[PDB]
């Protein structure tokens, strides 16, 4: 996260760290959506141009974390993957369309003050909240500039009109994506960055005061560049696939 702030303790209890077993390193962000399901970006797990194709056995999920590097005895929980599920129309060849994946844990994780699932939006919450100018929150242990933080970082960013999103890049953007960030003129700034991948873009519904995951950190050109915006997987648009996976293999 660049131009973010240190998270408060328990401010993002759905935040998940995807962790490589060997060599032990952060791989990506992710999010807890139930006691046994973790949501992330597909590119975190599969990305052939960079020879990335992780199997279950290569990874661990660490939940309830605050510190990037420390092992948080009595706080974090570390879980094993039972199975990975990648969107069958995930477009790694062209633009990361449908950049979304699910991970089922071997065993249910115990909720705590530091570990708690986020909600996934229904259509009406999505329609109410995914509006240009409405701010969301992005969290991550990713790089601080286009170099890593000691603790979980947080940044609030306004959703950006689709025409401005499109006009900022040469990439083909789809209905399964949205972009967020300040414009050059708005003065303030901030962005997700490498390592923030697969982490959640959340919004607090003013209707029932619950936190919803509206996006997934997907891609950008650089990090926090003027005239550029971060791109996010549109969770509600891929909701049907999510339900299906969890219904079938639940």
């Amino acid at each position: 996260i660049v131009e973010g702030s240190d998270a408060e303790i328990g401010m993002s209890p759905w935040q998940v760290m995807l962790f490589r077993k060997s060599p032990q390193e952060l791989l990506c962000g992710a999010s807890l959506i139930s006691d046994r399901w973790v949501l992330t970006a597909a590119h975190c797990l599969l990305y052939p141009p960079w020879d990335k194709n992780f199997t279950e056995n290569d990874l661990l999920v660490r939940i309830g974390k605050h510190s990037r590097t420390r092992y948080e005895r009595n706080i974090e929980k570390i879980s094993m993957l039972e199975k990975i599920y990648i969107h069958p129309r995930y477009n790694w060849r062209e633009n990361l369309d449908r950049d979304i994946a699910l991970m089922k844990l071997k065993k249910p994780v115990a909720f705590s003050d530091y570990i708690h699932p986020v909600c996934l939006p229904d259509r009406e919450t999505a329609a109410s909240l995914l509006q240009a100018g409405y701010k969301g929150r992005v969290t991550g242990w990713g790089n601080l500039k286009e170099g890593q933080p000691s603790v979980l970082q947080v940044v609030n960013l306004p959703i950006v009109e689709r025409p401005v999103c499109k006009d900022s890049t040469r990439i083909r953007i789809t209905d399964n994506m949205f972009c967020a960030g300040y414009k050059p003129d708005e003065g303030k700034r901030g962005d997700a960055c490498e390592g923030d991948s697969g982490g959640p873009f959340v919004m607090k519904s003013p209707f029932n005061n619950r936190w919803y995951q509206m996006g997934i950190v997907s891609w950008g050109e650089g990090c926090d560049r003027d005239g550029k915006y971060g791109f996010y997987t549109h969770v509600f648009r891929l909701k049907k696939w999510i339900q299906k996976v969890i219904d079938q293999f639940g």
């Binding site: 209890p13 003050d113 708690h116 100018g133 409405y134």
Partner: peptide, 28 residues
């Protein structure tokens, strides 16, 4: 899960985090 999105150390204790109001104020 039915309790999704309510954080133990904030919503459930009726405490607000330091910048969530900025989100609210944007929901215009």
């Amino acid at each position: 899960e039915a309790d999704c999105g309510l954080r133990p150390l904030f919503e459930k204790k009726s405490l607000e985090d330091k910048t969530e109001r900025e989100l609210l104020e944007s929901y215009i």
